[PDB]
Design an enzyme around this catalytic site. Structure first.
Site, PDB file in Angstrom:
ATOM      1  N   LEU A  16      -5.178 -12.491   8.044  1.00 23.82           N
ATOM      2  CA  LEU A  16      -3.888 -12.477   9.047  1.00 23.82           C
ATOM      3  C   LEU A  16      -4.643 -12.078  10.642  1.00 23.82           C
ATOM      4  CD1 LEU A  16      -1.313 -11.498   6.769  1.00 23.82           C
ATOM      5  CD2 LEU A  16      -1.563 -13.517   7.535  1.00 23.82           C
ATOM      6  N   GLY A  17      -4.764 -10.530  10.609  1.00 25.82           N
ATOM      7  CA  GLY A  17      -5.060  -9.790  11.750  1.00 25.82           C
ATOM      8  C   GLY A  17      -6.428  -8.945  11.488  1.00 25.82           C
ATOM      9  N   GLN A  18      -7.416  -9.111  12.443  1.00 27.26           N
ATOM     10  CA  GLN A  18      -8.743  -8.709  12.305  1.00 27.26           C
ATOM     11  C   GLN A  18      -8.926  -7.599  13.316  1.00 27.26           C
ATOM     12  OE1 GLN A  18     -11.802 -11.597  13.128  1.00 27.26           O
ATOM     13  NE2 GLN A  18     -13.426 -10.408  12.183  1.00 27.26           N
ATOM     14  N   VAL A  20      -6.626  -7.152   7.538  1.00 30.56           N
ATOM     15  CA  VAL A  20      -5.299  -7.608   6.608  1.00 30.56           C
ATOM     16  C   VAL A  20      -5.104  -8.892   6.366  1.00 30.56           C
ATOM     17  CG1 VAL A  20      -2.771  -7.261   6.812  1.00 30.56           C
ATOM     18  CG2 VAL A  20      -4.077  -5.908   8.155  1.00 30.56           C
ATOM     19  N   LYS A  35      -3.960  -4.518   3.070  1.00 34.39           N
ATOM     20  CA  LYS A  35      -4.801  -3.909   4.140  1.00 34.39           C
ATOM     21  C   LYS A  35      -6.268  -3.331   3.681  1.00 34.39           C
ATOM     22  CE  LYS A  35      -4.998  -0.689   8.341  1.00 34.39           C
ATOM     23  NZ  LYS A  35      -4.334  -0.008   9.222  1.00 34.39           N
ATOM     24  N   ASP A 122      -0.203   3.729  21.523  1.00 33.89           N
ATOM     25  CA  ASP A 122      -0.499   2.260  21.665  1.00 33.89           C
ATOM     26  C   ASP A 122       0.472   1.405  21.140  1.00 33.89           C
ATOM     27  OD1 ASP A 122      -2.862   0.142  21.838  1.00 33.89           O
ATOM     28  OD2 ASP A 122      -2.716  -0.105  19.539  1.00 33.89           O
TER      29      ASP A 122
END
Ligand SMILES: CC(C)c1ccc2oc3nc(N)c(C(=O)Nc4nnn[nH]4)cc3c(=O)c2c1
Length: 600
Positions: A16-18, A20, A35, A122
């Site tokens: 998914l996210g880099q 996760v 994660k 953030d």
């Protein structure tokens, strides 16, 4: 080959996210966001964090092969806010309702985090995930708690990235953009932020090492309503300057945002201006403040605001609350007209052309190009459907207005009959006594015959107006059905077909950019569809400017003339009815004068 745990497992391909990975539970099959990487406290305290706008940290486990700390978190199949902003339909700003959802979820989440005391700083569209609620609308959550584009001028060496995110969501582009983007021009970026023009919120460097175009208002390409821009500009303006002396703080921020979120919407379509507006007004405000906002958005005097709804006159009592107003949609608003002549403006939008296509086979350049051009066509489709909507609202408003004028004419007929019956029953009741000292009656007849003469002139000038309110009587609404575009032409969907084609090509290029290189066959397919993209866009713009725009401008000019004609007729009918009231009381000075003498 994939990684597992005691309760969950995930493949490395479904990334998914880099990191996760999109995983599943070993016993239930439900999908989860896995994660894979003092902690045992700060994580278990994050377990209990439950809120609608917070990604629920379910559990913490330890992987099998590497014994790494794995976070079992809530899965969000839709992605982040950045993913939503990457779609072409939001290249020039989110839809209004979606924007309100984003603001409500962000405020409602950060307020909970402050109640618990977790500073995020953030906060970018990449840190805000989107899920689908049980009702169908989106629900945005926070998860990862800066980025090079969402940093504070002093941090570049909390309420900043929130404002940059809101501007990015409302306009589709970043507020502070140099020429070659925030990369090699990064220093310019800093010089753009340290230029702190206070109220301004935008600064665009449209030339390499050139100036910075500042602006305090949202761009014309912003898809939000003008009222929402009016209420949104100060909130961003007061949270976008390096001075802590001039910063709002979360208390003022949450107060004003909560003020915006508690305002109901009233759809009001200025018919003489051909302009749709949304009035954001609290449910407890009176109709006087409503007329005030309608004035601040349309420059129409409050006392001159005459309202029409569902084919009837609408009288708003100055004390009537806004929540008791009739429910209105974008397709069934409250038409506002005025007795003063108003300029016919129409719709105001940014006129953008087609960016030229490059021949260089570049997996990144073709991707960015396809994104930009497909966003342009999306804006052209939005403006097309908006023009069609303005034309249909115009037709309904005119077709109602003529009937309203005919109703006023009918009331004038009522009063006219009331004057005629009295005129006869008083001009002949005196002749009853005449046929049985002469000046007292001769003057009466020399005045009553004047009354009947002028009354007859009123009758003729009224039957002339009834002849004008008839089909084809230099005032019929027949041209409105025979000028602009209609839903029968199906122009919006005609553009949306090419929009789906260009969107599929854009997505395929988004998949071709991830791959560092393509085979020969896939390369030739990429180039062929790259040309078909240009053909689709060219055909779309041709059908847009040479059919939708021309018909819209013809209908708009015709409307500009018909407005003059209608105002003229309204002034005439008003003068005639006023000449029916002052003589209704002039016959009252004579019905009791001599008809009732005095004698015992
Ligand atoms: C690539 C795109 C189509 C997509 C689809 C589903 C996704 O489903 C997620 N579900 C989560 N629960 C989190 C998350 O909680 N945090 C996180 N990952 N990366 N950045 N933030 C992230 C994602 C995605 O990225 C995602 C992307």
């Amino acid at each position: 080959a994939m990684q597992s745990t005691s309760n969950h497992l995930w493949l490395l391909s479904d990334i998914l996210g880099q990191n996760v990975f999109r995983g599943r539970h070993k016993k239930t099959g439900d999908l989860f966001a896995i994660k894979v990487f003092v902690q045992m406290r700060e994580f278990e305290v994050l377990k209990k964090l439950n809120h609608k706008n917070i990604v629920k940290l379910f559990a913490i486990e330890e992987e099998t092969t590497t014994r790494h700390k794995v976070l079992i978190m809530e899965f969000c199949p839709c992605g982040s806010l950045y993913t939503v902003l990457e779609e072409p339909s939001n290249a020039y700003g989110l839809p209004e309702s979606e924007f309100l959802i984003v603001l409500r979820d962000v405020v409602g989440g950060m307020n909970h985090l402050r109640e618990n005391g977790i500073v995020h700083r953030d906060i970018k569209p990449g840190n805000i995930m989107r899920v689908i609620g049980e009702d169908g609308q989106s629900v945005y959550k926070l998860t990862d708690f800066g980025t090079e584009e969402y940093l504070h001028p002093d941090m570049y060496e909390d309420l900043w990235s929130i404002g940059v995110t809101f501007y990015h969501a409302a306009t589709g582009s970043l507020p502070f953009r140099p020429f070659e983007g925030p990369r090699r021009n990064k220093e310019v970026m800093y010089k753009i932020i340290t230029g702190k023009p206070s109220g301004a919120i935008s600064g665009v460097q449209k030339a390499e090492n050139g100036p910075i175009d500042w602006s305090g208002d949202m761009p014309v390409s912003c898809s939000l309503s003008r009222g929402l821009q009016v209420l949104l500009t100060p909130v961003l303006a007061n949270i976008l300057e390096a001075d802590q002396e001039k910063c709002w703080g979360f208390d003022q921020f949450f107060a004003e945002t909560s003020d915006i979120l508690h305002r109901m919407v009233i759809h009001v379509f200025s018919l003489q201006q051909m302009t749709a507006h949304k009035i954001y007004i609290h449910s407890y405000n009176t109709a006087t403040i409503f007329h005030e906002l309608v004035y601040k958005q349309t420059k129409i005097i409050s006392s001159n605001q005459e309202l029409i709804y569902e084919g009837r006159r609408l009288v708003l009592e100055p004390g009537r609350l806004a929540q008791h107003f009739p429910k209105t949609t974008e397709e069934n608003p409250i038409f506002v007209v005025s007795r003063e002549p108003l300029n016919t403006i129409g719709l105001i939008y940014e006129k953008i052309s087609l960016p030229k296509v490059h021949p260089r086979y570049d997996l990144d350049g073709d991707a960015s190009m396809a994104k930009a051009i497909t966003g342009v066509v999306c804006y052209a489709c939005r403006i097309a459907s908006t023009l069609l909507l303005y034309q249909e609202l115009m037709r309904k408003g005119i077709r109602w207005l003529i009937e309203l004028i005919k109703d006023d004419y009918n009331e004038t007929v009522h009063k006219k009959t009331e004057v005629v019956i009295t005129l006869d029953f008083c001009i002949r009741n005196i002749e009853k006594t005449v046929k049985v000292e002469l000046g007292e009656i001769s003057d009466i007849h020399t005045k009553l015959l004047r009354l009947s003469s002028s009354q007859g002139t009123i009758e003729t000038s009224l039957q002339d107006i009834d002849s004008r309110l008839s089909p084809g009587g230099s005032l019929a609404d027949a041209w409105a059905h025979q000028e602009g575009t209609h839903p029968k032409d199906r122009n919006v969907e005609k553009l949306q077909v090419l929009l789906n084609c260009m969107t599929e090509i854009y997505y395929q290029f988004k998949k071709d950019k991830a791959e560092r290189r393509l085979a020969y066959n896939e390369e030739q397919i990429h180039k062929f569809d790259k040309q078909k993209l240009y053909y689709h866009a060219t055909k779309a713009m041709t059908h847009f400017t040479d059919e939708c725009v021309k018909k819209y401008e013809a209908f708009l000019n015709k409307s500009e003339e018909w407005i003059r004609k209608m105002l003229h007729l309204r002034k005439q009918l008003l003068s005639l009815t006023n000449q029916c009231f002052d003589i209704e009381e002039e016959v009252s000075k004579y019905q009791e004068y001599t008809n009732e003498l005095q004698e015992t």
